mmCIF file of C-alpha atoms in Angstrom:
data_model
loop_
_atom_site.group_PDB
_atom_site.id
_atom_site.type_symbol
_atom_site.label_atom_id
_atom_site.label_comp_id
_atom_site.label_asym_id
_atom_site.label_seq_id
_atom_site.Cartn_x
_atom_site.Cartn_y
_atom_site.Cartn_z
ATOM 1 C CA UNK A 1 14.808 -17.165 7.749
ATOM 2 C CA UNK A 2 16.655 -16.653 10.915
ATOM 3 C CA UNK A 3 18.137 -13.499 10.251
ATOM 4 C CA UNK A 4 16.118 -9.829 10.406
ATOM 5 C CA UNK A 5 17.618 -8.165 7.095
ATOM 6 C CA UNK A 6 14.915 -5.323 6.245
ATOM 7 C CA UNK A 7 14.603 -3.588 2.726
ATOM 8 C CA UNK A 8 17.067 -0.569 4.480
ATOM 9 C CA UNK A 9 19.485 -3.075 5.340
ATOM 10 C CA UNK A 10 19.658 -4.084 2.011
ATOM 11 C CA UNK A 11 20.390 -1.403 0.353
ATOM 12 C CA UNK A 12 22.816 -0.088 2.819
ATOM 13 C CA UNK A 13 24.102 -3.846 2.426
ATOM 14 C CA UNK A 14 24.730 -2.852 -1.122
ATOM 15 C CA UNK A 15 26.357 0.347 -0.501
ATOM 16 C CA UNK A 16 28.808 -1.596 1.607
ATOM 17 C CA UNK A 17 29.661 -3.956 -0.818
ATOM 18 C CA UNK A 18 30.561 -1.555 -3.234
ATOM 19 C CA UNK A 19 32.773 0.622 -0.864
ATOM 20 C CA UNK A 20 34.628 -2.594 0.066
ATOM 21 C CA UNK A 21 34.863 -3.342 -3.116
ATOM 22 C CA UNK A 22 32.727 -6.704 -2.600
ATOM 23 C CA UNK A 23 31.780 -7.193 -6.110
ATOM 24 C CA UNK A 24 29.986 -10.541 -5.743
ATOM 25 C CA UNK A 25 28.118 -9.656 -2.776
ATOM 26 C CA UNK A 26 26.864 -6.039 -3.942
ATOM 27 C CA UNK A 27 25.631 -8.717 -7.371
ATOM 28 C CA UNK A 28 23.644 -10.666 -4.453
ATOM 29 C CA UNK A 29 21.809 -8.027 -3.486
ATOM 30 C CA UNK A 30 20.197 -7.368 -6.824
ATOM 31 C CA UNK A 31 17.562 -8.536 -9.096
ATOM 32 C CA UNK A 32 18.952 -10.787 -12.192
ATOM 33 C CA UNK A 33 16.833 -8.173 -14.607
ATOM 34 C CA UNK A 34 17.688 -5.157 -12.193
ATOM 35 C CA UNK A 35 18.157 -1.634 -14.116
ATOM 36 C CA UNK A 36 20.204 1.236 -14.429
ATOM 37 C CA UNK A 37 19.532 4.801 -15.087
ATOM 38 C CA UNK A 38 21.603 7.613 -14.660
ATOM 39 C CA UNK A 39 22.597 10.818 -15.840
ATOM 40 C CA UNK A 40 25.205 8.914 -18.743
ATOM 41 C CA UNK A 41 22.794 5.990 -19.507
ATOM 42 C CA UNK A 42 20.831 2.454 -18.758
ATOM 43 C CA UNK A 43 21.931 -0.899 -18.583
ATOM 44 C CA UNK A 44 19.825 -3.750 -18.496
ATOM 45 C CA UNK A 45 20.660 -6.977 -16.014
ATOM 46 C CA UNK A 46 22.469 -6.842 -12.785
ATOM 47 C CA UNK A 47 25.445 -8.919 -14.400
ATOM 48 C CA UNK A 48 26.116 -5.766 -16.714
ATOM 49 C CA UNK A 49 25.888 -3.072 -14.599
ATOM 50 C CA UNK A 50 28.434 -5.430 -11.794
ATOM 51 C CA UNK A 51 30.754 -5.717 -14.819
ATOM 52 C CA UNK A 52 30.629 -2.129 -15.367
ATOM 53 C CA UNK A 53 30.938 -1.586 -11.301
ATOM 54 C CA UNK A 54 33.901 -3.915 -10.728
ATOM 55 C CA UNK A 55 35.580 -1.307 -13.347
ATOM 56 C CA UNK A 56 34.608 1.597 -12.075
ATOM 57 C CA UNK A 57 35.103 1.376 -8.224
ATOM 58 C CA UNK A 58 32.908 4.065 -7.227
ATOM 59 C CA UNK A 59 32.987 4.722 -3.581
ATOM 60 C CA UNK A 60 29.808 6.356 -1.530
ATOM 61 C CA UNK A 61 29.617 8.937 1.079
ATOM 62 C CA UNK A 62 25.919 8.747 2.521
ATOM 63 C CA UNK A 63 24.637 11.523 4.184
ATOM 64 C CA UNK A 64 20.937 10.617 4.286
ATOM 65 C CA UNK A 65 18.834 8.020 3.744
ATOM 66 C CA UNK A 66 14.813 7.905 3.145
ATOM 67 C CA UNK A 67 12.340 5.270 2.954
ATOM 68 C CA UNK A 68 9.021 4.711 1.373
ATOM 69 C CA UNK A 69 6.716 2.225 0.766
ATOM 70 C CA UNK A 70 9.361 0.091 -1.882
ATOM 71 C CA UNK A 71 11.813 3.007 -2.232
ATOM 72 C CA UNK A 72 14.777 3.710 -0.468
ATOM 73 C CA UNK A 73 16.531 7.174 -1.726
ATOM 74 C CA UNK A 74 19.723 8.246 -0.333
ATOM 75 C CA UNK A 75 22.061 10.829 -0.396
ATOM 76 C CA UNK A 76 25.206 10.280 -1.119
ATOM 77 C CA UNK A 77 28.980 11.895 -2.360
ATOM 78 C CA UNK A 78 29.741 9.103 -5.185
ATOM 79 C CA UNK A 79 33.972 9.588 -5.672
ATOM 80 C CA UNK A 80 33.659 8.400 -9.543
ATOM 81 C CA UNK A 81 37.439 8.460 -10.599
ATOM 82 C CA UNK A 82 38.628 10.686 -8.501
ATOM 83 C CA UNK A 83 35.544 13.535 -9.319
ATOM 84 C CA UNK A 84 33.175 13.502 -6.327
ATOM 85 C CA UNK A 85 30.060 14.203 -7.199
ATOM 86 C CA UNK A 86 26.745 15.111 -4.985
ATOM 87 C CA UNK A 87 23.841 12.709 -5.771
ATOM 88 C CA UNK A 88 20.735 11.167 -5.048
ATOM 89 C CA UNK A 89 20.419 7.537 -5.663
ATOM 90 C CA UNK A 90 16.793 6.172 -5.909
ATOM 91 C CA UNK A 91 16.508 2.425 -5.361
ATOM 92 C CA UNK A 92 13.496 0.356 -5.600
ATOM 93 C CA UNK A 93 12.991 -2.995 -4.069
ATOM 94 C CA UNK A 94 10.741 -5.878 -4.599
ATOM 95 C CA UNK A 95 10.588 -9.394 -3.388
ATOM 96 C CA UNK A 96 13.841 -8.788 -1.043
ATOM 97 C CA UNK A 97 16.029 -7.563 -3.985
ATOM 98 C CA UNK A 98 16.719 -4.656 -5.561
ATOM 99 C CA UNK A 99 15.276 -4.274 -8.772
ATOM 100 C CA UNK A 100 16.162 -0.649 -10.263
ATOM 101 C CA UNK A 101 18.496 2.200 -9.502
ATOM 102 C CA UNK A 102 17.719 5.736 -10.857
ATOM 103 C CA UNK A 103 20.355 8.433 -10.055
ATOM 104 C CA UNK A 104 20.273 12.173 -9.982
ATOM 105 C CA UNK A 105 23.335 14.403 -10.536
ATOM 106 C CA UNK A 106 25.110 16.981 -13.079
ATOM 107 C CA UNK A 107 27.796 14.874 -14.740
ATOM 108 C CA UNK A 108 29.367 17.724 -15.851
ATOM 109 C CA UNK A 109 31.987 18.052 -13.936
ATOM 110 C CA UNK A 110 32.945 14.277 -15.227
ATOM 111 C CA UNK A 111 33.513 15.851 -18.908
ATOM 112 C CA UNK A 112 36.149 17.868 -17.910
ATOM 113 C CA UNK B 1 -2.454 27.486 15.727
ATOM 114 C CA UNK B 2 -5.888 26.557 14.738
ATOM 115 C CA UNK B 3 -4.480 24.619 11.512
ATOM 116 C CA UNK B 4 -2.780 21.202 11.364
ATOM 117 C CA UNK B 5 0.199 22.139 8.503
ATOM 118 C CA UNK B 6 2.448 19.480 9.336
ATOM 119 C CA UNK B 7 6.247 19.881 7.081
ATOM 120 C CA UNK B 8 4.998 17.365 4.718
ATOM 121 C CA UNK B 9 2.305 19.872 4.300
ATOM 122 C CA UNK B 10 4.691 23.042 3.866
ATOM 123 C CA UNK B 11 6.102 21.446 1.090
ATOM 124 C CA UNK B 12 3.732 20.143 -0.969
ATOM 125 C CA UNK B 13 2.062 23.220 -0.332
ATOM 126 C CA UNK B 14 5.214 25.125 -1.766
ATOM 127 C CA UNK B 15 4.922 22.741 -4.690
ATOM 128 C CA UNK B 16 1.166 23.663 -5.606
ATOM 129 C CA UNK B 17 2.066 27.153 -5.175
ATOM 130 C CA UNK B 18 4.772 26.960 -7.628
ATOM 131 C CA UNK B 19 2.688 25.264 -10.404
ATOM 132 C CA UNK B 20 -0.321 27.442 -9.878
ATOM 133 C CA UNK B 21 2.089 30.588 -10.387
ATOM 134 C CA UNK B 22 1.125 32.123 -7.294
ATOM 135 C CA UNK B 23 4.755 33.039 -6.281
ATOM 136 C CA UNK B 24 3.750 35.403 -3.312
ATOM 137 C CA UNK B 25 2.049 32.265 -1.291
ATOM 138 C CA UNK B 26 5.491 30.131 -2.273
ATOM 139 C CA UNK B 27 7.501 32.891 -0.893
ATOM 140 C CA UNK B 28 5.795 32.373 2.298
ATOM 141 C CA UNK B 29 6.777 29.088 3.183
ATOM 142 C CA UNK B 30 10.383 30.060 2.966
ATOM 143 C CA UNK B 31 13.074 31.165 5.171
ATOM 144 C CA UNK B 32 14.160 34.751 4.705
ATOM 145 C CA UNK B 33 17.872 33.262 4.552
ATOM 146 C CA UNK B 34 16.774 30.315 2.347
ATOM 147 C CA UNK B 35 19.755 28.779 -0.025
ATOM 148 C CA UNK B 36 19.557 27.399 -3.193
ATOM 149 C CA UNK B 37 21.705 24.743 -4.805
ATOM 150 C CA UNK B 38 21.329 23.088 -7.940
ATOM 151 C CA UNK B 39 23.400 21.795 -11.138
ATOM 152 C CA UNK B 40 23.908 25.147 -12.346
ATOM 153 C CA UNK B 41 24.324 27.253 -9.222
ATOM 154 C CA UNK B 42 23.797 28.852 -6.019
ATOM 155 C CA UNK B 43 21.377 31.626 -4.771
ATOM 156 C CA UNK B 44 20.959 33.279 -1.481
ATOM 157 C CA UNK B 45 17.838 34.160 0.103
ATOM 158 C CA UNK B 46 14.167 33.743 -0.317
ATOM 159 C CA UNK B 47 13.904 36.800 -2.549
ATOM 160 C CA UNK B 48 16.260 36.182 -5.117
ATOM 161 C CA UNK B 49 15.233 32.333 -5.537
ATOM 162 C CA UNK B 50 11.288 33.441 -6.085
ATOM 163 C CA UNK B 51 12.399 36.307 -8.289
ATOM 164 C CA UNK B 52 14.275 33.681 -10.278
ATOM 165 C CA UNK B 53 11.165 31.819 -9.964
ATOM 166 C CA UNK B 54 8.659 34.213 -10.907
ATOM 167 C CA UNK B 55 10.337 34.574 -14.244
ATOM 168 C CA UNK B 56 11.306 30.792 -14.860
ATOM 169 C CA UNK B 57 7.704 29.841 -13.897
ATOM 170 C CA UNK B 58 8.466 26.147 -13.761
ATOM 171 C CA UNK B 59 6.152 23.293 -13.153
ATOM 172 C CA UNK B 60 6.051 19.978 -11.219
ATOM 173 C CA UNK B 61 4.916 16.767 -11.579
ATOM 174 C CA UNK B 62 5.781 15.282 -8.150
ATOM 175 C CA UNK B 63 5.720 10.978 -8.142
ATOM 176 C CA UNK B 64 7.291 10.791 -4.636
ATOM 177 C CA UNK B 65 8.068 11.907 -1.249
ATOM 178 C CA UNK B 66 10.034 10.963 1.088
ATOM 179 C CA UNK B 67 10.543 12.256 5.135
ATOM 180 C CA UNK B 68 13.273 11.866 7.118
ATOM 181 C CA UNK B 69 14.058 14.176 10.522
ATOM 182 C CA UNK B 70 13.817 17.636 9.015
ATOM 183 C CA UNK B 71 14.266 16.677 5.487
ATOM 184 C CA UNK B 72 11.913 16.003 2.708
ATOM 185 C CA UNK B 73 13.004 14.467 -0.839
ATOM 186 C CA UNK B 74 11.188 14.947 -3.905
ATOM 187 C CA UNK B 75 10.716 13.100 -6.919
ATOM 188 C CA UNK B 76 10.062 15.077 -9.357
ATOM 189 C CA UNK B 77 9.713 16.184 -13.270
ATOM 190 C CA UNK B 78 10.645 19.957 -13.756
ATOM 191 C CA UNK B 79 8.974 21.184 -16.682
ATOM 192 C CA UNK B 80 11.951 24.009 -17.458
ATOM 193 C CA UNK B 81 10.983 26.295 -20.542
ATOM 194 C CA UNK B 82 9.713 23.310 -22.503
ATOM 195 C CA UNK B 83 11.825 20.985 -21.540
ATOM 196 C CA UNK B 84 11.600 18.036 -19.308
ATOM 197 C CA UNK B 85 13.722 17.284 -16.652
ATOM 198 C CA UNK B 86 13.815 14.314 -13.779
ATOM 199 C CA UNK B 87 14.988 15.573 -10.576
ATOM 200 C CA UNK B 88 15.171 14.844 -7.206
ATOM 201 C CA UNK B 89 15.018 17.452 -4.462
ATOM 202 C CA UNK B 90 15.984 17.833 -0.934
ATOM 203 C CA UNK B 91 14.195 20.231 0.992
ATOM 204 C CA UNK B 92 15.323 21.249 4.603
ATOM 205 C CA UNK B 93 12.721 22.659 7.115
ATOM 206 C CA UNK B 94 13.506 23.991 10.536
ATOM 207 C CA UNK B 95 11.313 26.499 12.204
ATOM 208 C CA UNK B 96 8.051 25.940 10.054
ATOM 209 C CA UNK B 97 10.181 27.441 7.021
ATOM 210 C CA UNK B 98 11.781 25.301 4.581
ATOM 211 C CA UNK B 99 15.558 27.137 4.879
ATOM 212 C CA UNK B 100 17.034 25.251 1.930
ATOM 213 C CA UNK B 101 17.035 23.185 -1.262
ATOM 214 C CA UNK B 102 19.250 20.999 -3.031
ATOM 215 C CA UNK B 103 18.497 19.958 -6.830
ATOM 216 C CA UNK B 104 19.778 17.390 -8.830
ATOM 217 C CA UNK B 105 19.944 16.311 -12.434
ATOM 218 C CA UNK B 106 21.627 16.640 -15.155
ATOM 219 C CA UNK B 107 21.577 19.950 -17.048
ATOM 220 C CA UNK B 108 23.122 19.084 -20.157
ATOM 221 C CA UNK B 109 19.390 18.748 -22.179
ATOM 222 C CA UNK B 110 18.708 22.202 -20.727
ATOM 223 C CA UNK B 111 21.701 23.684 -22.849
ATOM 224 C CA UNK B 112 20.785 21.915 -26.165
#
């Protein structure tokens, strides 16, 4: 209540957390029933898709970010294992969490 | 000078052009230099892309924009030859031209 955190902090909040690999805080930030989609599949419930994040340790690059109405969508190099890949991560937020991540890119590259 | 087209404008406008077919008035709302990126390449210029696009005639189902500075981010499902794909895409106006886009999503339905 006496802090000013806005839906954009939030998410760049998020971003953060990942990149410093801050695995419980990046959890904090989402929805218990928050879901995945991406170009490789969907998981269901933040506490999956942190387990599969702790693993993973992708970092972000973010060149842009956009806001609207409950959407933040951002632009962003994601270093997945070494591959970086250019994508755009769309993240929607309701009731000061985020409850969904869709992301855009050719995992391709990924596959060999 | 007597209209009020504001870049939000140019590309939705580009957009209805594109699903209406009428690839002339779409040609007009690019740069001469435009670029093209997406998941499975690179063109250069406005003629080549709407050549390209002439013959791929695809469609658009646009469920949100964004604005940011001179960007604009898209939304989008591509209807490609049948099949459909969800995309996001980041167009870049300067000028009262949109000079470039960048696609993103994964091919790999497109190839069977």
């Amino acid at each position: 209540m006496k802090t000013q955190i806005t839906t954009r902090d939030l998410v760049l909040e998020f971003i953060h957390a990942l990149n410093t690999e801050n695995f419980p805080a990046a959890k904090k930030r989402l929805n218990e029933n928050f879901t995945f989609n991406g170009p490789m599949g969907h998981r269901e419930g933040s506490e999956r898709y942190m387990n599969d994040m702790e693993k993973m340790k992708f970092k972000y690059v973010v060149h842009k970010m956009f806001e609207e109405g409950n959407d933040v969508c951002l632009i962003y190099d994601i270093n997945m294992n070494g591959k970086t890949i250019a994508a755009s991560g769309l993240y929607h937020l309701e009731k000061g969490e985020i409850t969904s991540l869709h992301v855009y890119f050719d995992p391709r590259p990924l596959f060999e």
